[PDB]
Amino acid sequence: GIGKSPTGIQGFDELTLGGLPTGRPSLVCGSAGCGKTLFASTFLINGVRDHGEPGVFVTFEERPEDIVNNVASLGFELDKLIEEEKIAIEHIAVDPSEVADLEGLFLRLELAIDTVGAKRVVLDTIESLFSAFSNPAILRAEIRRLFDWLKERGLTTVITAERGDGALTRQGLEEYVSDCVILLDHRVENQISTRRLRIVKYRGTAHGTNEYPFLIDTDGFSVLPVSALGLLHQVHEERIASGVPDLDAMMAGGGFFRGSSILVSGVAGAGKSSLAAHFAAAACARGERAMYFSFEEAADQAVRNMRSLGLDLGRWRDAGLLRFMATRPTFYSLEMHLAVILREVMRFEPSVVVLDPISAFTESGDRLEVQSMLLRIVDFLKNRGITGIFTHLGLSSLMDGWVLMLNREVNGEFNRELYLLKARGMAHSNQVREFLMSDRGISLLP
Amino acid sequence: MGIGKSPTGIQGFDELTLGGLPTGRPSLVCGSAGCGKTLFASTFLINGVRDHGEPGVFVTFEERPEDIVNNVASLGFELDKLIEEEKIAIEHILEGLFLRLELAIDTVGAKRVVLDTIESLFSAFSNPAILRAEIRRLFDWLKERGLTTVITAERGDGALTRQGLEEYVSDCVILLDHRVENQISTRRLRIVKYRGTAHGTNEYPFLIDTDGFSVLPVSALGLLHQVHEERIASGVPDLDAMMAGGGFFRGSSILVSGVAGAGKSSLAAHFAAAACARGERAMYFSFEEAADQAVRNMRSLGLDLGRWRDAGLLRFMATRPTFYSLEMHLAVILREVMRFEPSVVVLDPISAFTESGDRLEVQSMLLRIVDFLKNRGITGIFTHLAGLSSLMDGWVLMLNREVNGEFNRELYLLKARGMAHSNQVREFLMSDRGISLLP
Amino acid sequence: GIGKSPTGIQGFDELTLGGLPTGRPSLVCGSAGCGKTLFASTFLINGVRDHGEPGVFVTFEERPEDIVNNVASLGFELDKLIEEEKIAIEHIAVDPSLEGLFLRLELAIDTVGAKRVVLDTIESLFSAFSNPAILRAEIRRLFDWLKERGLTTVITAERGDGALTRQGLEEYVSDCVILLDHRVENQISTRRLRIVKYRGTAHGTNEYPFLIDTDGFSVLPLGLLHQVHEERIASGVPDLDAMMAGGGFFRGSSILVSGVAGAGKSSLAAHFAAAACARGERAMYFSFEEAADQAVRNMRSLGLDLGRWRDAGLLRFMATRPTFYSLEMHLAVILREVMRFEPSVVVLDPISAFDRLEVQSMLLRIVDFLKNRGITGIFTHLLSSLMDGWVLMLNREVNGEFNRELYLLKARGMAHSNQVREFLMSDRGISLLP
Amino acid sequence: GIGKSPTGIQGFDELTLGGLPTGRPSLVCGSAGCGKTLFASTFLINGVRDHGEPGVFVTFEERPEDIVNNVASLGFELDKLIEEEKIAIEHIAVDPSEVADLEGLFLRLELAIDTVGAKRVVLDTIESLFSAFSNPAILRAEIRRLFDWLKERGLTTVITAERGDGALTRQGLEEYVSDCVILLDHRVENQISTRRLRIVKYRGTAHGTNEYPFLIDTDGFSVLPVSALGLLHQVHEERIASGVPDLDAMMAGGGFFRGSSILVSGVAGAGKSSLAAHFAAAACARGERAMYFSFEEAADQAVRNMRSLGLDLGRWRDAGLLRFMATRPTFYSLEMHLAVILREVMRFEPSVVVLDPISAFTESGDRLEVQSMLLRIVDFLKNRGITGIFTHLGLSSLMDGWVLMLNREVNGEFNRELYLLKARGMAHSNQVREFLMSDRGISLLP
Numbered sequence A, D: 001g002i003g004k005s006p007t008g009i010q011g012f013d014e015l016t017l018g019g020l021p022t023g024r025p026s027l028v029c030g031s032a033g034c035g036k037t038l039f040a041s042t043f044l045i046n047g048v049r050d051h052g053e054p055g056v057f058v059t060f061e062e063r064p065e066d067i068v069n070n071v072a073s074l075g076f077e078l079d080k081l082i083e084e085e086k087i088a089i090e091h092i093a094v095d096p097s098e099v100a101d102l103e104g105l106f107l108r109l110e111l112a113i114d115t116v117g118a119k120r121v122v123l124d125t126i127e128s129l130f131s132a133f134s135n136p137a138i139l140r141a142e143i144r145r146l147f148d149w150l151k152e153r154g155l156t157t158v159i160t161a162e163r164g165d166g167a168l169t170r171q172g173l174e175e176y177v178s179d180c181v182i183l184l185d186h187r188v189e190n191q192i193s194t195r196r197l198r199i200v201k202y203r204g205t206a207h208g209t210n211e212y213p214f215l216i217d218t219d220g221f222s223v224l225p226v227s228a229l230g231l232l233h234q235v236h237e238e239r240i241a242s243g244v245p246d247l248d249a250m251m252a253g254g255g256f257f258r259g260s261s262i263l264v265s266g267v268a269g270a271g272k273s274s275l276a277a278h279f280a281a282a283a284c285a286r287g288e289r290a291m292y293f294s295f296e297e298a299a300d301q302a303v304r305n306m307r308s309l310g311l312d313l314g315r316w317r318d319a320g321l322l323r324f325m326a327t328r329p330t331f332y333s334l335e336m337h338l339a340v341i342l343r344e345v346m347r348f349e350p351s352v353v354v355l356d357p358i359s360a361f362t363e364s365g366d367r368l369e370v371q372s373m374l375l376r377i378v379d380f381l382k383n384r385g386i387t388g389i390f391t392h393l394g395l396s397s398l399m400d401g402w403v404l405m406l407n408r409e410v411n412g413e414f415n416r417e418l419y420l421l422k423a424r425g426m427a428h429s430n431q432v433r434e435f436l437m438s439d440r441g442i443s444l445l446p
Numbered sequence B: 001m002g003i004g005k006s007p008t009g010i011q012g013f014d015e016l017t018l019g020g021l022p023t024g025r026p027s028l029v030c031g032s033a034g035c036g037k038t039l040f041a042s043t044f045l046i047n048g049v050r051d052h053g054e055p056g057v058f059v060t061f062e063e064r065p066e067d068i069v070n071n072v073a074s075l076g077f078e079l080d081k082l083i084e085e086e087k088i089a090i091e092h093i094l095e096g097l098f099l100r101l102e103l104a105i106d107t108v109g110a111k112r113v114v115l116d117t118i119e120s121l122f123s124a125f126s127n128p129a130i131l132r133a134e135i136r137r138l139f140d141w142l143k144e145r146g147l148t149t150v151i152t153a154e155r156g157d158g159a160l161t162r163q164g165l166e167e168y169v170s171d172c173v174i175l176l177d178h179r180v181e182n183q184i185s186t187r188r189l190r191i192v193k194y195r196g197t198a199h200g201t202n203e204y205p206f207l208i209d210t211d212g213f214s215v216l217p218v219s220a221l222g223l224l225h226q227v228h229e230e231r232i233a234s235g236v237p238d239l240d241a242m243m244a245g246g247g248f249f250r251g252s253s254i255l256v257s258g259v260a261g262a263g264k265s266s267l268a269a270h271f272a273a274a275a276c277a278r279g280e281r282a283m284y285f286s287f288e289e290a291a292d293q294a295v296r297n298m299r300s301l302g303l304d305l306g307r308w309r310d311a312g313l314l315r316f317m318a319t320r321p322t323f324y325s326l327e328m329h330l331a332v333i334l335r336e337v338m339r340f341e342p343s344v345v346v347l348d349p350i351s352a353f354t355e356s357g358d359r360l361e362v363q364s365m366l367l368r369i370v371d372f373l374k375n376r377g378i379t380g381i382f383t384h385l386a387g388l389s390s391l392m393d394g395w396v397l398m399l400n401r402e403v404n405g406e407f408n409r410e411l412y413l414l415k416a417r418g419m420a421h422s423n424q425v426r427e428f429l430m431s432d433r434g435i436s437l438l439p
Numbered sequence C: 001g002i003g004k005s006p007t008g009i010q011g012f013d014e015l016t017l018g019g020l021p022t023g024r025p026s027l028v029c030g031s032a033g034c035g036k037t038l039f040a041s042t043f044l045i046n047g048v049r050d051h052g053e054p055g056v057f058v059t060f061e062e063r064p065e066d067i068v069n070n071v072a073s074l075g076f077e078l079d080k081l082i083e084e085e086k087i088a089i090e091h092i093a094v095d096p097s098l099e100g101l102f103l104r105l106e107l108a109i110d111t112v113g114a115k116r117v118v119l120d121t122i123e124s125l126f127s128a129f130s131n132p133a134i135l136r137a138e139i140r141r142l143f144d145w146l147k148e149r150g151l152t153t154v155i156t157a158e159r160g161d162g163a164l165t166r167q168g169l170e171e172y173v174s175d176c177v178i179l180l181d182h183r184v185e186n187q188i189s190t191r192r193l194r195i196v197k198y199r200g201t202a203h204g205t206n207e208y209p210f211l212i213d214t215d216g217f218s219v220l221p222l223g224l225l226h227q228v229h230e231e232r233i234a235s236g237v238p239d240l241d242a243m244m245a246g247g248g249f250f251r252g253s254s255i256l257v258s259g260v261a262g263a264g265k266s267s268l269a270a271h272f273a274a275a276a277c278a279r280g281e282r283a284m285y286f287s288f289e290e291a292a293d294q295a296v297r298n299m300r301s302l303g304l305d306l307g308r309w310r311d312a313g314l315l316r317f318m319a320t321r322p323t324f325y326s327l328e329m330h331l332a333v334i335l336r337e338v339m340r341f342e343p344s345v346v347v348l349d350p351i352s353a354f355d356r357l358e359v360q361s362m363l364l365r366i367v368d369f370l371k372n373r374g375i376t377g378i379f380t381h382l383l384s385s386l387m388d389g390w391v392l393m394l395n396r397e398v399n400g401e402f403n404r405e406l407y408l409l410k411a412r413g414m415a416h417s418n419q420v421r422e423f424l425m426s427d428r429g430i431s432l433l434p
């Protein structure tokens, strides 16, 4: 096979089944601000601090001081690594030389490689040297000289590529001369930007072909890990207590399955948030830890509103079992939102997760995007064994349980009814049940 | 007096080209980066040596042989073994070019040639007429030498090739394409030109998996259905009894429509369990619930899907629609149905694809699925949460409808093609004894 | 009226109102694999075979043996014609490189006494002219030369990146321009031909789909001149027939059987076809969701034995899939089979299986052809004003049981029953009551 | 003001309020086959045969023999005019001269002008001479030399322009140097081609700015005449007899207004075609002449079908009062269809015009195109005083009268009812009326 050098970006390495190709040049293309320089920096830094592989960073415009300080904010301590002689930075600048001896660069490169003992290399803005080459055949020959140099030396090299007016690179050659080609793009849609990565080419390995949204937060380059893939869900035969005993009773077995995904759907003011809060509070009382993701209400406001029904979510927030997360759709974009959901869930290790409401994303993306991000969330939760409570104003087919709460007018008065529409794996009551809200909470009438 | 074809060993490609590539003539596999031109040419050579003994030479102008060999070693091409057996050679590099090629060919007496990165030379020619003359010189040399050549071409910022002339100088031109839509990449092959023969003019999706370069074969053409008189047992004897003759015809396509919690997955599980208990092998494609979850939920109704699975008769496949494209979904389905050769297939629910494509794409996919299963005499069950009765030989509508604050479960036998069927509506009950219709 | 030379493609000659312009050059433009070379080959070979007009194929790049073999499969049999001195192929080659070309041409044309010429891949020469003025001046010199000699010439133009040709001038210097394009839509590729310019004549200006089949370059030639007959047709359901004054529908009519699934659309269409075959008429049944054996099996349930008629050769059952080769291609296949079989009754089941405007045009054309040929057509659907008769078959829920009823919603030119008729399906078939 | 030289294309001259500008150069741009050469030919020919204005046709590639024969099919008898010395053709060809004395062309031009006494000039494929000029400033200067030459001589000149890759002309200069610029385009939509003309520029005059569909039939360049514009309708206080006396009675005054537009709408088999045929037959019996435009039925078939109801449309067809026109939507494109409708109506001078059905165009164009072409037809008819009967399966607001024919099921039987929904300018019955079809025709029950 082909050897794989890992980068340290967990999601990227997973999608590439081990990382970049070892002893070969890799191309990371994109426009300005897409993440190519930071990806190469992370490649080098993680190669040193996770695989004892020293690195050299060749820069043709960006100053070495700039290169270290532009990552100091991510705590990479590149200044540290440079003083410790695990990473070196070689700066090459030109001006009258460009009109027209690349062996000099080869010598300088080899010298830095030997000083640091480098096994990984980064070549940033090679365009500064190769934009002088006007004839395409000559440009191709020289790029081949450089890439074959690196191959011979067996250095794992990440080479930057400016997209310019082109689909991958300005001149449209390095994408064909490289063995692994990655595209980073920063696409805006309805004033919202999303970073996406794509493995366009990778000889000698399978990988993910699709576009994969990624992130450059204060924690650096980060990709959604495919590990939490779909349909590997944990199956539990134990049941969950919802906090509404009269609902829990309607099902044979005493309640919904643990790690089940249950959709509470209805009209506004029908009790969806109330039921979800009941779920979370029952879990926290049992001693589990729960997450409540509000997208329409503030955490303090939800605690208040539920106080009216007798749920003291504040007690759980203080104990540290319940964690509220309030965020509106426009802020934290759809992929951003998926990422924060999954991440904060990993950190808190909840047992029950409530999404109130999953309709808040209905108007923030086409049917496919909304449905697919919801698929990802539900798969993540069930693979972790988390009981998910999704409130809503096709999803029913995706959910393990379905509760419908209706405040309907009859004879000049609104009555609240509850339907258990779906409850896979059990017998359950077909009978509509009237339900009342009060200080005692949600109750069901005979 | 048709032309002569040399097969590539890619079943789908050879079926679409009616024999393979033009023999003794150069073809042009155009494509962007990572679309599979080099892999298609490598497969051409490897299948030539394995299936028909025709030695092969891979002439690369820029990439090195060890890199070629490692690039394909992960797919089990055993290039190194073939080079030692002197069946395949990998040589690195206009009369001089011709001599170097004759050398590379003499290494193993190659009958199949591949030209990788011919752009190294042809980018030097700036004048269009000169470039065209040289290209035609090379292509005519390859025509006369008695070798079947596959030439890779770089699309670049072009429709097929970067300079836009080799596609016109060649006689067989195939575009390899990797198009993204809704973040999903689909690999497609197209025959843009093929002089001397009929062939598939449409776009055809293909995979580059552990099986290599693979095109779905159109040998499962539509409307060649296997027609059987024998009936298939549903596992619900009252349902099968509603139909004169004992139930649905074997090899039929049967839709099970309804609202969530209506019993569609349950009826389909009854079908699969009945088949496995008869000793036939069944396949449950679940697009929404994991295999173990489905087994658990069906145990409640009293079906030991787990027993049938461990017996090897039942194959569960859990697959999220959004993970692939619709074309790739069809390809994966059909491939696994081939590998398993089941008698009963379940798709639970096909409605999970409607979201992932417009009516035309999903309808075509379901056309191909039903045509495949019926051409093989496989009874297909499709659950649904819309005019799909077009492709369905049978149709069962399961309702869980509210009356007086109570939900009654009813069954409609809407379509029973070719048989007297009860058009009455039957109330049913679900229990540990399964699905039972009340008399 | 300009002088025209037929190409031999029925549809193309009909569209161009006689064919290509005589003694003048024509420009067949297209991207790679669109059919310009085959079009030119057909021009020449049909010229020699149908009109005795010898031909010369001047190729600047492609080899003559390649030219012969790339068309041998189509039965054109060019090699015999070269031996017989009806057609010639002349290979002009160029490598790092004015009237000498004209000299060689003239020699070629005189060897075989050619009145038709093809010029394939003049780009070999015209790609070296950088100056646009120079290039078009040379193009004009060539076109003039050909017009002075009076040879009907088809010139191939490579579209390349351009909209017609790579350099964008031959389309202006030529008098007749035909753009062939192989356009993909939903992974389905359709070949279209368009007469961009044809000086001196009216002609079809739209895009016309064509097919390069194993028979070759083919275009489908329909109109609103329906053949009118009073004769009445037996439906197989004599009571339905009786509901109509005189005893049925008009022979040549177009009928729509509409309803839900399991309503009896295919049953009624099979009844029509079986009645026709029984009285001795050739009937055709185009299904787009059912195999022929499946149809005979399912109709034997109601008592129709279509196997009898199929074996007798009176019934021809054809099964296709709509999503394969595009709507106009379908139309073409259905049409060719109707032409072959000269059926009295044609069935299309379901027509709903076939975007909106395309399907509307296809259906209008099918009805037009059947009517003009005098054939009665039974269309099934899961239009009402485009047909002549309309039968609505209902399987409606009443008291938790589906009752089966029939409406005769439309029957142009006759008094029918405004009454609904409850109908029963049984081993004997379709029956009704008042 | 500016002098206007008419071309002979009635619609073009109307849209330009008199034709091209006199003594100035005009540019007719377009791709191949759009109608520029034929427009210039018509310009010259009609200038000679309608305004005693002799012409010269300068051609730079197309042979003079070709130029005459390519119009012989239109009966222009250009060979005649050339022998009679009213039009001349001057052919200029080049080849080695193009690499690099335009005064020679000026001399040749002036000589032809003086021979024929020309007042109109056409310059066809000036590109053959001016494509040699590479520098844009020099090309502009030379084009200005030529156009100023023509201006000085006061010749009304039509200059061809090849569109090429450009929006109007290949080099993008003549459109700015000309005083009148016209664009001819041949746009395909759903495999159907439509010819459109546009006055892009015309200094010194008002004109139509919109795109105007035109035609090149066997009668040559032809434009829809805007003269039959909208809302100048003829207003009649006399009434029409529909042939259904019981319908005519429901309206105060004895029937619909003459020159009225009446929409018969309903379900299939409801009697729309029958009522329309009754209208046409009543008119033809009165002695008027009527047109019946079928888009779903053949003329013989419609005569048969109506025979069943007792209308002998064959008698009227034979008398010459009734004229049938059968054509399907796809054939005779939407603009094509408008054109044939209007034209054949002008020729036949009908009194009643039936369009059966105007729904046949529902699926052949977007709502705006269908509605606007229908607007044009209705305006044309009412401006001529023609009574229009439009059958159908927003238009109601456009129609002067509205009849609704419904075959509705009740108690397992279909009954036919007739509603007079609208009838401007009169009192009319609000009562639904049952109607029966028989050999006696359409009758209404008390």
Ligand SMILES: Nc1ncnc2c1ncn2[C@@H]1O[C@H](COP(=O)(O)OP(=O)(O)O)[C@@H](O)[C@H]1O
Residues within 6 Å of the ligand: A030, A031, A032, A033, A034, A035, A036, A037, A038, A039, A070, A071, A072, A073, A074, A216, A217, A218
């Ligand atoms: N220290 C940092 N902290 C947070 N975000 C950063 C940091 N550095 C860069 N980014 C984000 O990642 C992007 C990466 O920029 P960079 O890769 O250096 O430029 P390019 O991709 O053009 O080479 C920036 O545009 C910014 O949005």
Ligand SMILES: Nc1ncnc2c1ncn2[C@@H]1O[C@H](COP(=O)(O)OP(=O)(O)O)[C@@H](O)[C@H]1O
Residues within 6 Å of the ligand: A266, A267, A268, A269, A270, A271, A272, A273, A274, A275, A308, A309, A437, A438, A439
């Ligand atoms: N003490 C109480 N007694 C009765 N009803 C209450 C009480 N407190 C809150 N509610 C009801 O709860 C509703 C809000 O429920 P909520 O959980 O927000 O449902 P949704 O999520 O559908 O908006 C209010 O409309 C109100 O009728």
Ligand SMILES: Nc1ncnc2c1ncn2[C@@H]1O[C@H](COP(=O)(O)OP(=O)(O)O)[C@@H](O)[C@H]1O
Residues within 6 Å of the ligand: A176, A200, A201, A202, A203, A204, A205, A206, A207, B031, B032, B033, B034, B035, B036, B037, B038, B039, B040, B071, B072, B073, B074, B075, B152, B208, B209, B210
């Ligand atoms: N061993 C492998 N396993 C799976 N996929 C592979 C393997 N080798 C190559 N591929 C696929 O083929 C693509 C490269 O094919 P190749 O023909 O070499 O590229 P190009 O189209 O640039 O010539 C990669 O993007 C990858 O998805």
Ligand SMILES: Nc1ncnc2c1ncn2[C@@H]1O[C@H](COP(=O)(O)OP(=O)(O)O)[C@@H](O)[C@H]1O
Residues within 6 Å of the ligand: A421, A422, A423, A424, A425, A426, A427, A428, B258, B259, B260, B261, B262, B263, B264, B265, B266, B267, B300, B301, B383, B430, B431, B432
């Ligand atoms: N033992 C049982 N008794 C009664 N009903 C049951 C039993 N087990 C499962 N069910 C019913 O089966 C339903 C799940 O059926 P399923 O096959 O998932 O239908 P669908 O696929 O239409 O959602 C539950 O809603 C429940 O009502």
Ligand SMILES: Nc1ncnc2c1ncn2[C@@H]1O[C@H](COP(=O)(O)OP(=O)(O)O)[C@@H](O)[C@H]1O
Residues within 6 Å of the ligand: B192, B193, B194, B195, B196, B197, B198, B199, C030, C031, C032, C033, C034, C035, C036, C037, C038, C039, C070, C071, C072, C073, C074, C212, C213, C214
């Ligand atoms: N013998 C044949 N049988 C069927 N189809 C053919 C045959 N020869 C050529 N074709 C078809 O004709 C198309 C174009 O042929 P050709 O005219 O040579 O292309 P070009 O546009 O380069 O001239 C091909 O795509 C192929 O499908």
Ligand SMILES: Nc1ncnc2c1ncn2[C@@H]1O[C@H](COP(=O)(O)OP(=O)(O)O)[C@@H](O)[C@H]1O
Residues within 6 Å of the ligand: B414, B415, B416, B417, B418, B419, B420, B421, C259, C260, C261, C262, C263, C264, C265, C266, C267, C268, C301, C302, C425, C426, C427
């Ligand atoms: N022997 C029979 N007795 C009663 N009904 C029958 C018999 N054979 C077939 N059928 C009916 O015919 C129907 C199939 O009719 P079909 O022609 O397929 O209608 P459609 O084309 O509208 O689907 C079935 O639903 C079935 O009820």
Ligand SMILES: Nc1ncnc2c1ncn2[C@@H]1O[C@H](COP(=O)(O)OP(=O)(O)O)[C@@H](O)[C@H]1O
Residues within 6 Å of the ligand: C196, C197, C198, C199, C200, C201, C202, C203, C205, D030, D031, D032, D033, D034, D035, D036, D037, D038, D039, D070, D071, D072, D073, D074, D216, D217, D218
């Ligand atoms: N004699 C004719 N009879 C009918 N239609 C014609 C005639 N001559 C030309 N046409 C139509 O009008 C168009 C005008 O062509 P022309 O104006 O000469 O070319 P261009 O517009 O490229 O200069 C032709 O493409 C053809 O469709």
Ligand SMILES: Nc1ncnc2c1ncn2[C@@H]1O[C@H](COP(=O)(O)OP(=O)(O)O)[C@@H](O)[C@H]1O
Residues within 6 Å of the ligand: C385, C409, C410, C411, C412, C413, C414, C415, C416, D266, D267, D268, D269, D270, D271, D272, D273, D274, D275, D308, D309, D437, D438, D439
């Ligand atoms: N002699 C008759 N007696 C009764 N009804 C008739 C007679 N002749 C024709 N019809 C009726 O005329 C209808 C056709 O009317 P038509 O004018 O085509 O209406 P539409 O234009 O709405 O289709 C048929 O459905 C039929 O019921």
